[PDB]
Design a protein around this ligand. Structure first.
Ligand code: MG
Ligand code: MG
Ligand code: MG
Ligand code: MG
Ligand code: MG
Ligand code: MG
Ligand code: MG
Ligand code: MG
Ligand code: MG
Ligand code: MG
Ligand code: MG
Ligand code: MG
Ligand code: MG
Ligand code: MG
Ligand code: MG
Ligand code: MG
Ligand code: MG
Ligand code: MG
Ligand code: MG
Ligand code: MG
Ligand code: MG
Ligand code: MG
Ligand code: MG
Ligand code: MG
Ligand code: MG
Ligand code: MG
Ligand code: MG
Ligand code: MG
Ligand code: MG
Ligand code: MG
Ligand code: MG
Ligand code: MG
Ligand code: MG
Ligand code: MG
Ligand code: MG
Ligand code: MG
Ligand code: MG
Ligand code: MG
Ligand code: MG
Ligand code: MG
Ligand code: MG
Ligand code: MG
Ligand code: MG
Ligand code: MG
Ligand code: MG
Ligand code: MG
Ligand code: MG
Ligand code: MG
Ligand code: MG
Ligand code: MG
Ligand code: MG
Ligand code: ZN
Lengths: 53, 143, 118, 112, 48, 101
RNA sequence: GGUUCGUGGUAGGAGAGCGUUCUAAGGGCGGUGAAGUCAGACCGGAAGGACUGGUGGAGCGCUUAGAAGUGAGAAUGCCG
RNA sequence: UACUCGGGAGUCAGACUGCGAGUGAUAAGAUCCGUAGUCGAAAGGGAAACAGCCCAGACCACCAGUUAAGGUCCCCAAAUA
RNA sequence: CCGAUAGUGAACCAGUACCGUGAGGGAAAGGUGAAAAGCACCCCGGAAGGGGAGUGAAACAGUUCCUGAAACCGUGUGCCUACAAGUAGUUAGAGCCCGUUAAUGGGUGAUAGCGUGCCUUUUGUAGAAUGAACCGGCGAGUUACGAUUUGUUGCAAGGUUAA
């Protein structure tokens, strides 16, 4: 329940191979032509599916 | 200073066919393990593979002196509790004559990464016909 | 007068970490771990100057043997004939001829073969 | 001619380990796309890193007169800063150490 | 000649310092042996 | 055409125009050194000596007198407080081979 | 300068030395860049000593003696 | 090499192996003596590994040679003598 | 004699802060620059903080600010690495990449042989016996007065003064 040996630099770096976070699934808006998330209301032009909300 | 050291791909490696009828299992395997190693060439280099390719035919007619056909046992454990399995030399020669020859020769090769590469160089056939006619192998006579 | 311990401790310790260059992990960074890796390397290099002479003679012997068996001779019979006839060439040069100038190696093997036959 | 510009945010309260995880997304990307990534990444370091990137572009055109439409994020790294030492009273009269770490954030933009 | 003073040869010697490393022969135990009454500070018995 | 000569307690295979390193010899830079102990002469023929070829010599010129790169010989024994350090530089002689006779 | 015999080593005995701070005399270098610090493939049988280049921005070597708060990898050592 | 006089010591927990005895059960890697060796304080080669068994005592360097114990079918140098 | 872990506990608003009911215990903390000439003005930002411009010999001297080592944390890249059993090295060694205090040079290394850390205490420790997370500073035979022995110097049947 207590570490027997200290963790080296290589072993501590190998474990953090998977602690990254992925890239957002963003998309180009059809109306205002800038980035937004898919299946989401565009935060700039306030439109979804071509109709203002 | 000045002592010749071979390079990978510098030495020519040949193909051989050896007939394994009537010869003892260990007399043949000792002779073969030196051809794969390359100890018959003055270009021998310990850290380089300079040996030749060997094909063994008629492996089902290998000789077993004395009562070795029934008294010689081959063991095999599967790392499970009570998972030890055994076979006899004579029973394996009838069913798997190829495994008998590769088990004998593999123990006569160095136990490292290079000796694990010389085992990929040996082909054993229980019958009298092989499939490597494209390599044009020669006939090697035992000493 | 007071003698504070400056500028001398670091110079001596850093000279050891420099000798540990190329070692894995902390063996090339920290003094204590690098100090005992340098001492071990000196000990390994001391006795490897002795095995280096053994390693090469085994290579020459196993290489003269291979070339002698192509002339219906063994290494032991070849060595007996050469010493019996009087040739004093050592293993380093007999192995050199067996690889580079195999034509002359057969000349020496003929002298050894004749001396063993009177 | 300079062809590059940089901006630094020194002693930001966020910890270095929590900021390096967001820097790793925008490195090597175009400033137009890199701004959108920080806008749609739900982490607390996104607003901080986004002002450093926007400030780097700002003086990449006012000071050196470069094109906003050709810039890329050439370099982006996080350094360490002076930590604040605090304590947390644990059970049975003992106290434990707490590190309130800071960081330096550097972003360099340049032409492609 | 105050820059070329040379005392009579053999009249002076350099004192011995113990407990200064194992390369001088007076290192770890400083010439005392191992774990007795005579290996302790202020140790030793009466004259008689 | 090459020869095998004995010098420095060992043997070296020699060829015309070659630069070799041997144990320290006597002679200033520019002097000519002749070797009288020739064991084997090759090339377009064969002269095997018993043990020395009779009347065969090799001549060479001294190019440099010097010492090899520095070593450091170190020994220690664990738990016994024994260490020993020492440096070494092996002298040598550099020669250029002129002709084989 | 030769000849002969030697040259494993714990506790321990004997000898010769390296390096640090300060003092005295002689002789020196340094804003055309001192000490310190960083790097290097140089020198000596060891402890160790130079040289070149970057940083630094004002002190420091050498020779012969003298005097010591005299050399750390370990003390469940003290402090950061 | 011995001996005498003088300055400085450390040591007084020993281990196994062969031989000769006691205690023990003609047990013990037991215990206690006499005698020789090695380790302690001894690296190198052989007993697979293996302080005490066999050979043999490391000033340094060499890509030189002859031997000791032990070995010469392959792993692994040398006789499928 | 010391030179900021030294020298007074205290070179700085120190018997202070803090701890205890109380008697009492008791720290850490020096250095911009010759001169504040301590950054007018512009740009991003709520601000902090930056990039220019300017002062200055120097701003990589910008309000723990002379110098700025090691542990520790990062970015870029030359060589190697996903069939391999490892006290991490040493000896032999191809391939690839460089070019020095110029000399039988430098970096990395597929593969092959050999190889069970340092200290202490022990008959005997790789030891499953003890100590150390790592780096840096500090940390242990000294002095006074007497005894004895060796070396050196002066005088010598004499030598030498103490207060
Ligand atoms: Mg002082
Ligand atoms: Mg110190
Ligand atoms: Mg390496
Ligand atoms: Mg409470
Ligand atoms: Mg002395
Ligand atoms: Mg000693
Ligand atoms: Mg010690
Ligand atoms: Mg002790
Ligand atoms: Mg004692
Ligand atoms: Mg000795
Ligand atoms: Mg000896
Ligand atoms: Mg002494
Ligand atoms: Mg000084
Ligand atoms: Mg300098
Ligand atoms: Mg001290
Ligand atoms: Mg130490
Ligand atoms: Mg420490
Ligand atoms: Mg005596
Ligand atoms: Mg008694
Ligand atoms: Mg006894
Ligand atoms: Mg017994
Ligand atoms: Mg006993
Ligand atoms: Mg002992
Ligand atoms: Mg031994
Ligand atoms: Mg042994
Ligand atoms: Mg055994
Ligand atoms: Mg062994
Ligand atoms: Mg031991
Ligand atoms: Mg063999
Ligand atoms: Mg103080
Ligand atoms: Mg200071
Ligand atoms: Mg109160
Ligand atoms: Mg500003
Ligand atoms: Mg501002
Ligand atoms: Mg500016
Ligand atoms: Mg100016
Ligand atoms: Mg100043
Ligand atoms: Mg500073
Ligand atoms: Mg640093
Ligand atoms: Mg496999
Ligand atoms: Mg692979
Ligand atoms: Mg194993
Ligand atoms: Mg290896
Ligand atoms: Mg190992
Ligand atoms: Mg200990
Ligand atoms: Mg015990
Ligand atoms: Mg204890
Ligand atoms: Mg512990
Ligand atoms: Mg430590
Ligand atoms: Mg005393
Ligand atoms: Mg007198
Ligand atoms: Zn939109």
């Amino acid at each position: 329940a207590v570490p027997f040996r200290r963790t080296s630099k290589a072993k501590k770096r190998k474990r953090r191979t998977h602690v990254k976070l992925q890239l957002p699934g963003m998309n180009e808006c059809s109306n205002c032509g800038e980035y937004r998330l898919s299946h989401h209301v565009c935060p700039e032009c306030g439109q979804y599916d071509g109709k203002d909300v | 200073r000045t002592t010749y050291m071979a390079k990978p791909g510098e030495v020519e490696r040949k193909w051989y066919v050896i007939d394994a009828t009537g010869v003892s299992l260990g007399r043949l395997s000792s002779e073969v393990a030196s051809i794969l190693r390359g100890k018959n060439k003055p270009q021998f280099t310990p850290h380089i593979d300079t040996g030749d390719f060997v094909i063994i035919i008629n492996a089902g007619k290998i000789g077993l002196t004395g009562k070795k056909a029934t008294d010689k046992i081959y063991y095999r454990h599967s790392q499970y509790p009570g998972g030890l399995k055994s076979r006899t030399a004579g029973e394996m020669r009838t069913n798997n004559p190829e495994k008998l020859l590769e088990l004998s020769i593999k123990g006569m090769l160095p136990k490292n990464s290079l000796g694990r590469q010389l085992f990929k160089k040996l082909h054993v056939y229980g019958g009298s016909e092989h499939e490597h006619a494209a390599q044009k192998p020669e006939v090697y006579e035992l000493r | 007068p007071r003698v504070k311990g400056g500028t001398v401790t670091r110079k001596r310790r850093k000279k050891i970490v420099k000798l540990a260059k190329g070692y894995y992990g902390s063996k090339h960074l920290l003094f204590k771990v690098a100090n005992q890796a340098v001492m071990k390397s000196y000990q390994y290099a001391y006795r490897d100057r002795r095995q280096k002479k053994r390693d090469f003679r085994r290579l020459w012997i196993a290489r003269i043997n291979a070339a002698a068996r192509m002339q219906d001779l063994s290494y032991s019979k070849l060595m007996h004939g050469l010493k019996l006839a009087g040739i004093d060439i050592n293993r380093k040069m007999l192995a050199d001829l067996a690889v580079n100038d195999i034509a002359s190696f057969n000349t020496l093997a003929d002298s050894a073969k004749k001396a063993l036959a009177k | 001619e300079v062809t590059s510009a940089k901006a630094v945010a020194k002693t930001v309260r966020i910890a270095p380990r929590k900021a390096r995880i967001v820097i790793d997304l925008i490195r090597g990307k175009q400033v137009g796309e890199a701004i959108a990534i920080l806008k749609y990444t739900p982490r607390s370091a996104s607003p901080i890193i986004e002002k450093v990137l926007k400030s780097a572009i700002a003086n990449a055109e006012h000071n050196y007169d470069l094109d906003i439409n050709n810039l890329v994020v050439e370099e982006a790294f996080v350094d360490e800063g002076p930590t604040l030492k605090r304590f947390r009273p644990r059970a049975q009269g003992r106290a434990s150490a707490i590190n309130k770490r800071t960081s330096h954030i550097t972003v360099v933009v340049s032409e492609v | 000649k105050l820059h070329e003073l040379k005392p009579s040869e053999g009249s002076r010697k350099e004192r011995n310092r113990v407990g200064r490393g194992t390369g001088s022969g007076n290192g770890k135990t400083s010439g005392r042996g191992h774990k007795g009454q005579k290996a302790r500070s202020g140790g030793g018995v009466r004259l008689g | 055409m090459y020869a095998i000569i004995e010098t420095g307690g060992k043997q070296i295979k020699v060829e015309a125009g070659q630069e070799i390193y041997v144990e320290k010899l006597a002679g200033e830079v520019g002097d000519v050194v002749t070797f009288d102990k020739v064991l084997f002469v090759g090339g377009d023929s064969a002269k095997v000596g018993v043990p020395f070829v009779d009347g065969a010599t090799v001549t060479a010129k001294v190019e440099k007198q010097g010492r090899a790169k520095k070593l450091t010989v170190y020994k220690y024994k664990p738990k016994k407080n024994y260490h020993k350090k020492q440096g070494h530089r092996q002298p040598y002689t550099k020669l250029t081979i002129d002709a084989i006779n």
